[PDB]
Amino acid sequence: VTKSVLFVCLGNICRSPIAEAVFRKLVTDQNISDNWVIDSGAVSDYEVGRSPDPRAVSCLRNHGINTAHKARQVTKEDFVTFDYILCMDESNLRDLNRKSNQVKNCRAKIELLGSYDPQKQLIIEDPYYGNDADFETVYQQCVRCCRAFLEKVR
Numbered sequence: 765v766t767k768s769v770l771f772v773c774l775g776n777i778c779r780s781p782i783a784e785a786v787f788r789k790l791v792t793d794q795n796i797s798d799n800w801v802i803d804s805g806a807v808s809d810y811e812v813g814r815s816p817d818p819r820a821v822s823c824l825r826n827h828g829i830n831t832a833h834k835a836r837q838v839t840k841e842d843f844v845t846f847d848y849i850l851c852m853d854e855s856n857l858r859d860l861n862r863k864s865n866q867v868k869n870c871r872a873k874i875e876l877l878g879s880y881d882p883q884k885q886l887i888i889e890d891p892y893y894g895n896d897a898d899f900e901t902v903y904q905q906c907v908r909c910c911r912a913f914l915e916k917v918r
């Protein structure tokens with residue numbers, strides 16, 4: 765039975781298009797992409813329709829990964845469609861949990877991506893007003909945590 769994950773952050777231009785791209789490369793590498801539906805979403809308005817930040821693009825490229833995602837907001841139907849909704853920080857979590865209450869047949873489990881890190885760096889911090897090394901951190905956190913998540917639910 766096919767499974768589904770939706771990665772989320774504030775804007776869907778930095779962290780979650782990275783997490784989505786990382787997870788997609790993992791499942792493909794493991795020859796299991798047929799068993800997964802994967803996407804990324806924003807809590808916020810700020811970047812609807814835009815491509816990921818240049819910094820995320822170049823970081824991904826450094827690791828041999830490309831994305832074609834356009835920024836989109838999370839919807840009520842997302843809470844019914846996805847098996848897991850994995851978010852980056854405590855604001856995101858709060859926001860998501862509040863929204864899921866107005867959705868009557870909510871099925872998704874809503875959790876911090878960081879909760880799966882074997883290294884226990886629970887928070888994936890918003891790198892918008894930082895530099896290339898902060899993008900790199902976020903990419904490494906993503907790799908650790910997606911690998912652990914897939915071990916546990918594959």
Ligand SMILES: N#Cc1ccccc1-c1cc(NCCCN2CCCCC2)c2ccccc2n1
Pocket residue numbers: 774775776777778809810811890892893
């Ligand atoms: N607020 C805050 C905040 C506080 C602390 C640390 C980072 C942030 C912060 C601020 C952002 N600007 C919003 C874009 C401007 N838009 C112009 C078009 C209209 C809609 C908005 C972020 C944008 C994208 C992704 C992450 C971001 N994160």
